[PDB]
Structure formats: structure tokens, C-alpha cells
Ligand binder design. Structure first.
Ligand SMILES: CCO/N=C/c1ccc(OCC[C@@H](C)CCN2CCN(c3ccncc3)C2=O)cc1
Ligand SMILES: CCO/N=C/c1ccc(OCC[C@@H](C)CCN2CCN(c3ccncc3)C2=O)cc1
Ligand SMILES: [Cl-]
Ligand code: NA
Ligand code: NA
Ligand code: NA
Ligand code: NA
Ligand code: NA
Ligand code: NA
Lengths: 297, 245, 242, 58, 49, 242, 49, 99, 58, 48
């Protein structure tokens, strides 16, 4: 039991996150109301105090005489799903014949979509994101040609054996999900759930993944968070002999059922690496176009 | 009646006679983790008053040429008071914060500081200048401790992002002709219910002069900026021996 | 089997097609979603948050970039001199490019709505002054003098306790939506010009600086909406990202 | 359709309307969602809110 | 294999077969083979008027 | 026929796709299923059955393999000496690999739950002793001495009639699920260390052995669950199986 | 999957076929149609002028 | 010695908080574990070879030739089930021909 | 669907929910099954069960 | 930094010319006798 007053009247423990604001429906843009000339002392909408940290609450109606306008412009196209549920390139896998990279008939792709600017800049607008996704795999030769080749794609989650060759025992794929398809067939396409161990993936992790002294050698792990590492995507020509043709697989991702939290300033310097926000120091450019003077267009 | 305020929590009280309201980050107050969101099974410890109080950690000098600084939470308190001890003895930690940046001058000084909070504030390097070197920021820079760290390139917040858009984050301004402090309440922000106070900095505090300090020869030239902050609804779990990193 | 017949479109992969695809992990259940502050539901929410407008987008060397974030005002000669000017076109190259509104605006072909710019004076408390900020709807050339600028939509700002003032750039358009304006025939969608003039003069007493700065913050009104998704004009990548 | 509730948006305030042919909910289309929005969360997160006609600092 | 892409006013026009714009992260694109039947899509009324 | 249009995915063979396939033997009826003891419905049932944990996974020559199944205790010098240590990570290389839990755990990418290890003393009835078994949550290095180990979650075991004692390795994690931990960045998912120390000392009278062994059995608690099927890291085959 | 069987006509593109095609811009809403004088509904209206 | 697993629970070994656990147990059912198609047999039909240079081949229906699949089913002694078999054919280079 | 009851799980305690297009039940999908489980069958098959708080051997 | 760890007030000069520091009663005993150097420092109140 609890008998001492400070304990009874304590707030220690309420899990109810009291919120100052709530969402209202807004299918269309706000209408404009008729307004007239106001010559008052005391009331002053135009004057603000930006130091407070809130945006101006001054409206059209109070700054000029307005007419009535019934605004039925839709706000549907700016929802997260409308913005993100458009498939874009996030990975390329090369399977050349007599080359340097993969002359063995197979390839392992670390599942990381940060190798392409377009898609990357979009998702990096938010800090945390939770979503399902539709992946489409387009394959063809380097000339965009289609040939009668059978391929096998396999998802190798963290902990599963990564194939070390075109003939690796791992391709038995008894538990991992695999897809067999011909280049002649249409692009393979599957749905992928939200697989993180966290409640959301995060494009930014200001921290280290483990304890201990964080000496120079291990500074490569700064910002690396396992909750964002979903695994490996392996592909191979299905055979015991080298394929007769060189191949390329372009991976497209289309997010769906999206939720995001914490907006961030949008990237304004060229991207350099997948794992970090490093930018070219001798080449810091302004965010946009510049002009000769502040008094001339 | 909005320019005057008092913040009392724990055995500490702050007063200001030139405030500009209070910001409550993302519109919500700090709160303890519910039994639904929680996942770890051990009963947490909630020290309350011994750790949820105002700690005044550091003072910087504002100069006509200052670039701006940043501090990281909870990195700043990990070695201070009873809060620090709990952060070290426990694996798991979570809390909110009440931040109060102070900076007063005279009615003849001018200048404006942008005080903001940026969740998951990852730092980048200039990549060897040419962008061909894959360098990484050292521990001393990602977790600067109480001393904070001075920004190298404010325009891009040392992370390839425009400071012009930093206002999309909870923030206030300290415009010397208007107020002498900024106050921001921040709730726990993370994709997990609890986390390590040591390996993960939930957010960063940025204090950057957007409008340079200025005054006439003869006015006090030493204008300090002091950082005071208080954890809120601190919870700790996963007890063991003390660990500093 | 059941009689079917294939139509055009068969086998095509449309990147925006919203269809159904076979799930790779049957019976997989995702980690529960806990509460996280700051969830955003619609990009329009972000368009109403003010961000700094680089009215002074002239310096370009790295050490002077922070200067773009603000323009100055100082004691003049009382001839209602010009302080600064800039196009109001939010989706056009120029000042608006520094704002989140302008950036997001970059992902939509068309937009419609009133915009607003709030100016914050950061001079000393002893400094005073009155400015005339005007918005000149389409067709009007850059105002020769203040007398001309004054004929349009404007606000006369008086420095004081309230550090800021808000200029509303009301939606005055012939069409219900504007596409991004730019030099050429697409200037048809231009919004107009914004010009700042000294209404009286920046006055200050002995002991206070002769020059102070103004910071401009901009965002959209609540009647603002955008339509027709398109990729942004920038692609922040030169070679492959390693 | 009586399936598995494994969609990323299961238990979300915004009401979705989708199509699906598999036992797993995440395989469903993106569909249409509710058009609610809360600007104030980011544009006006002040403790004591001020009116449009008043002087913000008093 | 071909790629068709709709580039609305303001979006980057591809300047080459390898242009970064073909990443098509937001524009609508269609990938189809000459062997496949004619690609076919529906287009709404897009004018500002 | 009825107008249809083929979408991407057409013709693909997804190994986990749960579809319908034409039956080869129409009207075939299978042999009736009689009653058979021990039917299992869910792998979790097996994860709660204790199996021997090879804490002493050091000897490797064939003739000494059975020794891995148990570790010793014997009269010490009363300095609270260290008896044994092992990582609690169930899906990691090491002791847990000998348990059915660890093996089954190998077929899932992620797991979540409290584990338990029961230690059985097999010394003579005349032998007595008190041990301190401790679980050190993440971040804590291998305990230097007993005084340090004692600061974590622990049990002080007293030998007696009840031959065994149970150490519960409660689920103390930052994330709702852990992926298999291992050296590298994935150590983020480590569970922690388990260490056994002499609380007092192994005491025995004249006529009884100076050394006895402890057998460790481990399994999962009822809040344990696993998700995301994946193939096990081992493939017990070198060439073709004839 | 469900047993189907393709009939003649498959893959053909008839210019007057009135079918359904996938929309390129999901959730796009066109500009409102204001009032415009002189709308014509049927060519026969013009044949009487 | 009794032969039963320990019945000791978290609540009785340490002071615990309340945790509402909604983690699903669906993915560990027998069908979830086994209903994933895996390789169980290979048949070769070579031209001028040793094994089958006659154009046909007889495969004794036994899935125990591949470790992955085998180790999984051998976890149980008796098993009763229906099955879906898929046959993937191509030349040794993974090529597709009109055969 | 009125078909043949020739599925391997016909007459099973666990309730299945499946899809099918043929007269033979075994051609159906795997579907979802009931989530019942009985650990004690393997983890606690003692004749006289003992409580958690008692001394197992008395 | 050390002083800050105790009971304190952060005073901001302004219109209100004054501020009040409360030296709350934090004692082991219900009453203190006059403190002074020696064993009677047991009754000391503290430092400001
Ligand atoms: C039969 C094989 O088919 N499987 C296809 C497939 C496709 C995608 C799969 O997982 C995709 C996971 C991605 C949506 C995760 C992308 N993310 C999550 C956050 N993140 C990241 C990257 C770099 N820094 C921080 C976060 C990412 O790159 C798995 C299997
Ligand atoms: C038109 C032809 O299509 N027919 C395809 C087909 C495929 C499989 C067929 O039977 C598959 C039976 C297997 C599921 C039985 C596998 N088993 C049962 C137990 N068993 C075994 C093996 C070695 N030792 C003990 C048991 C096995 O290998 C029959 C026809
Ligand atoms: Cl201290
Ligand atoms: Na599909
Ligand atoms: Na399925
Ligand atoms: Na089939
Ligand atoms: Na049949
Ligand atoms: Na069509
Ligand atoms: Na659609």
C-alpha cells in the first residue's frame, strides 16, 4: 500500500502522452471568406513574433479585402502513399561473362536502397519510416536485349548462408524465399512486409551499434544500425556451366502502406556514399540559383 | 504574462523576465513508457526528483564571428549527477527533456540565435575536400560531451543539409531585442521504447547565430550563452555494473 | 478453363500501377508499432511550416554562405529608397529554393494557393523604422519607385515590440493552378514581384549599430494544394554512390 | 476477406480501403487513405496558444 | 526492352540513354518488350485550366 | 472471352507462394489417420523442452566429446573464484548450439523472449556448496571478479535435496526482437553474459570425491517467439548424397 | 491459379475497343470544370444550324 | 531428475513490470515451417553421356538426397501431408529451348 | 464449395481456412491454421504434477 | 558546475528588481542548536 502523501499525489508512471494538437479532416483546400475594411486599434493580425517558434497565423481575410471562394482543390495527391508509392530504381546487379566483378555466374546484393539519389532524397525527408513494399525485377542483357535464360533470385536474411558460387548448396532454398523466372517472362514482382526488429526503419542513426572504445579503426560503424539491415539478395543463372549471355538486373521498389515521423531538412549537397551524409568540402554549393544583386532580378 | 516565466522541477527553479512562450516539441509532453509499448520485462527504476532537475552544463561566448555549436542528448549528462550514475549502471534508458538556453545583452546590442532540436543528428565529414576520401567523424565529434562542438560549415549543418530548413524542427529564436532565452520541452523520440544512453544520442541541440552579434565600442563585449537542461520522466532498466561507454 | 482474352497493356510494368503482388513471407507478422512523436500524414502539413527564405542569394564562396540567410537595412537619406526585391514564384529558381516549401513544391507539376512571408527584424531594441513591403501581381514590371510599388497589395511595417510582420501573397491568378514558372512561355504562370522599400527611415540613437539585418521566413496558407507528382529538377549525384 | 493482419499500417488512425487476393494483408494494394492532417503539430507547437488578432508577445 | 517515361513540365528531361532521370522515382514510367502487346495506359485531364 | 490483362509476376515460380495446383489423382481418398501419441502443432512447443547446454565446449577429439556435456566444481581456496562463463546469445555459435532451442532458433531470423537455464548438481549426497550465477545484460564486460558479477541479475544456489536450480535470463532488450547476434555490427543484438562463481565453497567430508560435475539444461520461457523463416547456417552435406 | 483459357482476339489492339487501362497518376484530381457557354452534346445539334 | 522442464517464471525470479506481449506465434506452425518449396531431386537427360543417353530417365521418388530439406523433415518421426511439386527444366547453362 | 474430403488434414483438431478450385480437397492452399499448442505434452509429462513454489521432491 | 548540483535559483534581472532564494529546511534532526566550529558543526545548515 501507499500512505505517504507525496506518493499518493505522484504522477510517476502515467503512460498517457498528453497531446497539444489533433488532426482534422481536410479533403480540400480551405475556402476564402468575404472580408471588409477593418480600421481597429487593439486588434493586429499582421504583427507576429517569430521568436516564439510558431508560423504566422495571419490569413488572407485579415490582410486584404477578400471575396468568397469555394475551394474544392483536392489534397489527396500529397498523402504519404501518393508521394512514395511510385516505383523507382534502388539497385543494379551485373552478371557479366569475362569481367572482373562477377565472372562466376552469381551475385550478392546487400539490401540497401541508398545508392540512388532520386529515391534516397525522397525517403530522407523523414527520420523514421514504416512500410511494406513491392519489388520488381527487370532483367536483360546490357543492350536491353531479351534472351532465353532462366534465373533464380533468393532472399538471404541475416544469419542464412550466402551463396559462394553458382553451384552453392544454399540454392536448395528449402526455407528462404526464392523466385525462378525467365528473361523472356515479364518482370518478376513480389510483396515484402515490414521486417525490422524495430517499430520503424530509420534513415539516420546518430550513434554506434555496440559498446566499447570507439577508436579510429571502428569509426566506420558510426551511424550503422542493424535494425536497417534486412539481409542479402542473391541472383544466379540456373546451371552448372557458365551462361552464354551477360546480364543486368535492375531492382525497383514501390513502397505502400506508409507511415513516417519527424521531418528533416532536405539534402542540398551531392551524395557521395551510401552509409553516410559525407559531402564534398571544397565544393559546398548554395541550395539554389544566385544573382548579382539583392535589388535586381 | 507570456514574457515572464518560472520553471520549477526537482530542487531547481529558473526565472526569466523576457521569454517568448514555450515550445512543446511535436506537440506532445514527455510520458513514461506504457505497458503496451514496453518489451523488456524487468521493473524499471524511476528516481524522479534526484534526476529530473535542471543541470546547468556549459557556457560559450558569442562573438561577432561565432559559427554556432551543437550538443548531444543524452550524451551531455552521461557523466553528471545522479542522472549520469543511473545512465551508467543501466543498459536501458528513456526520458524527455526541458531545455533552456540563456543569453541576455542590452537594449543596444543586436543579433539572433536559432535554437533547435534535431532528432538523430548524424554528423558527416568533408570527405577529404574532394569527396574521394570516405572519412568518418571521430568519437570526440559525434559525442562531444558537455563541452559541445563548434560547427565547421553551418550552412549545411556539417551533414549536407540546409540550415535554412532547420525550422521544420522544434525551435525558438533568441533575438536580443526581444527575448533572452529559449525553452523547448522534448518528449522521448526513438523507434524503440527504451535504448542505450551511451551508444545512442536521440537528438542534438543546435544554437546557431543567423543574424551576427553586434554592438558599439564600449558596450560589454562578453556575451555568454548558457545551456541548462532537465530530464523529464526518466526511466531506467537492465541493471548491472557501471559502464562509461 | 474459363474463356478469357488478353488486352493491350498485358505484361507491361507501370511504375505507378497500384496492384497486388504475391507475399514472400507467409504468416509473417511485423514488429508492433509503438508510439512515436511527430507523425506526418500529408506533405501539406510541412508546407505550412516557415523556413528561411534566402532573399539575399548573392554571395557564393563557402565562407560567406550563411550571409545568404539575411538582408540588411540601415540609415538612409529619406528618399523612400529600395531595400530588396524578389520574385514570388515559389517553384522557380531563386530565393524560394532555400525553403522547404520550394523544395517540396519541386515534386509537383502544379500548385494553387496563397503564400505568406514573415519578416523578422533583428536590430537593436533602440532601433525603429517603418517599411513598405509590396506584392505586385502579374503584368506589373519591377516598380520604378516606391510610389509605383505602393499601388499594389502591400503592408506597412512598424518596428517595435513585435519583432515580425507578415506579408500575405494572396492567390491572384487567372487559372485555378499554376505550373512552375520560368523564363519563356511558362512565365504565363508567374506569381509576381515582392519589393521592400523604406517607408520612413531606419533611425537609431547614439550607441547603437547603423546596420541591422532582417530574416525572412516563408510558407503556404491553408488554401495551398499541389497536384501531379513529378520528379524534382535536381538529382544530387554525379557518379555512382559508393 | 478473412486474412492475416500483417500490414505495416495495421492499427493506424487513417482508414485504408484496399484490394487483396492473398492470406497476407501486406500483399494488398496501397489503396486510398483518410485525408486528415494536423499542421499545428509542426507549425504551432506552443504551450500557450495566441490568437491571430492579439499581440503574440504581451 | 524499352522504357517510356512521362516528364511533366519542370521534371528533368533525359539527355541520354544513361541519364540519371530514368531512375524515374516519381515520374510514371512503363517498361515493356517489343514482343509484348502494345503498352496501354489511361491519362486524366491534366490542364491547369 | 472475358477481357483480362497480365501483370508483372506472371509465370514466376515463388517457392513460398501458397497457391492452388491441379490434383493428379482425382477422387483419391488417403488412408484414415489413426491416433498417434505425441503430435506437435507448433515449433514453440519444442523450444520449451530443456536439452543439454554444452557450457564446456572445449575438448574436440572424438573420445572426449561426451565431456562437453558437463563442467566441474571442486574444493577451492575461498576467494570467490570463477567457475565458468558463456554468452547468453541463443542463436550464436557456442554452447547453445548443442540445444534443440539453438538449433530451431537457426531457422528464424529474429527471436524475442526470456530464456532459462537449469543447473543440475551431480556430486555425492555428502557434498554441499553455494554458487552465484549471474546474467550480465548488454554493455557489461566479462565480470572481473564476483563482486562485479553480483551487480547484475543473479541467483545464489544452495546445494541440497533439490538437485537443481534455475537461472532465468529475463528478456532485457532495447528492441522488441533480436536478430542472431555475432561479431561485428550485429553484436547490437547480443543478449549478455552468464557467469558462475563460488559463493562459498564446495565442501565434502572424508570419503567423498573432490570433484563433481554440473549438467546444464536450457530452454525458452512462455513469452518466447520467433519470426521470419530462413535457412539454417549449416548444410550437412559435402558432396552428393548417394 | 484459377483455370482460364485464351481465345482468339488475344493481344490484338482494336482502335475502337472500349476497354479499361491502368491509370498513370493515382489519386490525381483534375481542375474543377467551371461554366462555359455553348457546350455541345451531340453532332446532330450542329447539323441543324 | 523428474524429467520435466523447469516451471520457474520471470515473475518469481526477479521483480518484473507488466508487459502486454502481442508477438505472434503464427510463423512457427508446421505449415509455416514446411510449406516452403525446396529442391528434392535432379534428373539429367544428356546427349552423348554415360548415365542417360537414351532420352528418358527414371527417378525413384525419395526426397532424402538433399541435406536442407532432409534435415528439416527428420526433426519428426512420423509425418502426414499433401504436397505441391514443381518441375523446372532447362539446359545445363540455364538456357531455354523449344523441347 | 462441395468437393471430396481427401485432404491430409481432414478430421484434424486444428481448423483450417483455405482456397480451392478443384473437386479434390488436397489440391487446396495451405491456408491459416488454429494457433493452439500443448507444451506440457513434452515439457511436463509427469504423472503427479508439482507446483512452481513447492519443492519438486518431497 | 558543482554548485549547480544543489538547491538553486537562476535569477534574471528585469522589471522585478528582486528574487528569492528559499533555504528549505533540510535537516537530520527536527531542531538545530546554534552551529559553530567544533562538534556543534553537526547542526550546520549549509552554504549559499
Ligand atoms: C524471392 C526473393 O524475393 N525477395 C525480394 C526482396 C526484396 C526486398 C527485400 O527487403 C527489402 C527491404 C528494404 C525495403 C529495406 C530498405 N531500407 C530500410 C532502411 N534502410 C536503410 C539503409 C541505409 N541506412 C539506413 C537505413 C534501407 O535501405 C527482401 C526480399
Ligand atoms: C504427372 C506426373 O506428376 N506426378 C508428380 C509426382 C510427384 C510426387 C509424387 O509423390 C511424391 C511422394 C513424396 C512426397 C514422398 C516423400 N517421402 C515419404 C517418406 N519418404 C521417405 C524417404 C526415405 N526414407 C523414409 C521415408 C519420402 O521420401 C508423385 C507424383
Ligand atoms: Cl556529478
Ligand atoms: Na503482381
Ligand atoms: Na501467402
Ligand atoms: Na499452379
Ligand atoms: Na480432379
Ligand atoms: Na488495357
Ligand atoms: Na491507381
Amino acid at each position: 500500500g501507499d500512505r505517504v502523501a507525496d506518493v499518493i499525489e505522484s504522477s510517476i508512471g502515467d503512460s498517457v502522452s498528453r497531446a497539444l494538437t489533433h488532426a482534422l479532416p481536410a479533403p480540400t483546400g480551405q475556402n476564402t471568406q468575404v472580408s471588409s475594411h477593418r480600421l481597429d486599434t487593439g486588434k493586429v493580425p499582421a504583427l507576429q513574433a517569430a521568436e516564439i517558434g510558431a508560423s504566422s497565423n495571419a490569413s488572407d481575410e485579415s490582410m486584404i479585402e477578400t471575396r468568397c471562394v469555394l475551394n474544392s482543390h483536392s489534397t489527396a495527391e500529397t498523402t504519404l502513399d501518393s508521394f512514395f508509392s511510385r516505383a523507382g530504381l534502388v539497385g543494379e546487379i551485373d552478371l557479366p561473362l569475362k569481367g572482373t566483378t562477377n565472372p562466376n555466374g552469381y551475385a550478392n546484393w546487400d539490401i540497401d536502397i541508398t545508392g540512388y539519389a532520386q529515391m534516397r532524397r525522397k525517403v530522407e525527408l523523414f527520420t523514421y519510416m514504416r512500410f511494406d513494399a513491392e519489388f520488381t525485377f527487370v532483367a536483360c542483357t546490357p543492350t536491353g536485349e531479351v534472351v532465353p535464360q532462366l534465373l533464380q533470385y533468393m532472399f538471404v536474411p541475416p544469419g542464412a548462408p550466402k551463396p559462394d558460387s553458382r553451384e552453392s548448396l544454399a540454392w536448395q532454398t528449402a526455407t528462404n524465399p526464392s523466385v525462378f523466372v525467365k528473361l523472356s517472362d515479364p518482370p518478376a514482382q513480389v510483396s515484402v512486409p515490414f521486417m525490422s526488429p524495430a517499430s520503424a526503419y530509420q534513415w539516420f542513426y546518430d550513434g554506434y551499434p555496440t559498446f566499447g572504445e570507439h577508436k579510429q579503426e571502428k569509426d566506420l560503424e558510426y551511424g550503422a544500425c542493424p535494425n536497417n539491415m534486412m539481409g542479402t539478395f542473391s541472383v544466379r543463372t540456373v546451371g552448372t556451366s557458365k551462361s552464354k549471355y551477360p546480364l543486368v538486373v535492375r531492382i525497383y521498389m514501390r513502397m505502400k502502406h506508409v507511415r513516417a515521423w519527424i521531418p528533416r531538412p532536405m539534402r542540398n549537397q551531392n551524395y557521395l556514399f551510401k552509409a553516410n551524409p559525407n559531402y564534398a568540402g571544397n565544393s559546398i554549393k548554395p541550395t539554389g540559383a544566385s544573382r548579382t544583386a539583392i535589388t535586381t532580378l | 504574462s507570456d514574457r515572464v516565466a518560472q520553471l520549477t522541477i526537482g530542487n531547481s527553479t529558473i526565472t526569466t523576465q523576457e521569454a517568448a512562450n514555450i515550445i512543446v516539441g511535436y506537440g506532445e509532453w514527455p510520458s513514461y513508457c506504457s505497458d503496451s509499448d514496453a518489451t523488456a520485462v524487468d521493473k524499471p527504476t524511476r528516481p524522479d526528483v534526484s534526476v529530473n532537475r535542471f543541470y546547468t552544463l556549459d557556457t560559450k561566448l558569442w562573438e561577432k564571428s561565432s559559427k554556432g555549436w551543437y550538443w548531444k542528448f543524452p550524451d551531455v549528462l552521461t557523466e553528471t549527477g545522479v542522472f549520469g550514475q543511473n545512465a551508467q549502471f543501466h543498459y536501458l534508458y528513456r526520458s524527455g527533456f526541458c531545455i533552456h538556453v540563456q543569453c541576455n545583452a542590452s537594449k543596444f546590442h543586436q543579433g539572433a540565435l536559432l535554437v533547435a532540436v534535431l532528432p538523430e543528428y548524424v554528423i558527416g565529414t568533408v570527405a577529404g575536400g574532394t569527396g574521394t576520401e570516405d572519412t568518418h567523424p571521430p568519437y570526440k565529434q559525434t559525442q562531444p560531451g558537455a563541452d559541445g562542438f563548434e560547427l565547421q560549415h553551418p550552412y549545411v549543418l556539417d551533414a549536407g543539409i540546409p540550415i535554412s530548413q532547420l525550422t521544420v524542427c522544434p525551435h525558438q529564436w533568441i533575438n536580443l531585442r526581444t527575448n533572452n532565452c529559449a525553452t523547448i520541452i522534448v518528449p522521448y523520440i526513438n523507434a524503440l521504447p527504451f535504448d542505450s544512453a551511451l551508444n545512442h544520442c536521440n537528438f542534438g541541440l543546435l544554437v546557431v547565430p543567423i543574424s551576427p552579434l553586434d554592438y558599439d565600442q564600449g558596450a560589454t563585449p562578453v556575451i555568454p550563452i548558457t545551456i541548462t537542461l532537465a530530464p523529464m520522466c526518466s526511466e531506467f532498466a537492465g541493471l548491472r555494473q557501471a559502464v562509461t561507454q | 478453363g474459363f474463356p478469357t482474352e488478353l488486352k493491350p497493356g498485358t505484361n507491361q510494368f507501370l511504375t505507378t500501377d497500384d496492384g497486388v503482388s504475391a507475399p514472400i513471407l507467409p504468416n509473417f507478422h511485423p514488429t508492433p508499432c509503438i508510439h512515436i512523436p511527430g507523425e506526418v500524414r500529408n506533405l501539406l502539413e510541412l508546407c505550412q511550416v516557415e523556413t528561411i527564405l534566402e532573399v539575399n542569394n548573392v554571395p557564393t564562396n563557402a565562407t560567406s554562405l550563411m550571409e545568404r540567410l539575411r538582408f540588411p537595412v540601415s540609415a538612409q537619406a529619406g528618399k523612400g529608397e529600395l531595400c530588396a526585391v524578389f520574385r514570388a514564384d515559389p517553384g522557380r529558381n531563386g530565393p524560394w529554393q532555400s525553403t522547404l516549401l520550394g523544395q517540396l513544391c519541386g515534386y509537383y507539376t502544379q500548385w494553387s494557393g496563397s503564400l505568406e512571408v514573415t519578416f523578422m527584424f533583428t536590430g537593436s531594441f533602440m532601433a525603429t523604422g517603418k517599411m513598405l513591403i509590396a506584392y505586385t501581381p502579374p503584368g506589373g514590371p519591377l516598380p520604378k519607385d516606391r510610389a509605383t510599388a505602393m499601388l499594389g497589395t502591400h503592408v506597412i511595417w512598424d518596428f517595435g515590440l513585435q519583432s515580425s510582420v507578415t506579408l500575405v501573397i494572396p492567390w491572384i491568378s487567372n487559372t485555378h493552378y499554376r505550373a512552375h514558372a520560368r523564363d519563356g512561355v511558362f512565365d504565363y504562370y508567374t506569381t509576381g514581384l515582392v519589393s521592400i522599400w523604406y517607408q520612413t527611415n531606419y533611425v537609431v540613437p547614439i550607441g547603437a549599430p547603423n546596420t541591422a539585418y532582417i530574416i525572412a521566413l516563408a510558407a503556404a496558407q491553408k488554401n495551398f494544394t499541389m497536384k501531379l507528382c513529378k520528379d524534382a529538377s535536381d538529382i544530387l549525384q554525379t557518379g555512382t554512390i559508393q | 476477406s478473412h486474412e492475416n493482419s500483417n500490414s505495416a499500417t495495421e492499427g493506424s488512425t487513417i482508414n485504408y480501403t484496399t484490394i487483396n487476393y492473398y492470406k497476407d494483408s501486406y500483399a494488398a494494394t496501397a489503396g486510398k487513405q483518410s485525408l486528415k492532417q494536423d499542421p499545428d503539430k509542426f507549425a504551432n507547437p506552443v504551450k500557450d496558444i495566441f490568437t491571430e488578432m492579439a499581440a503574440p508577445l504581451k
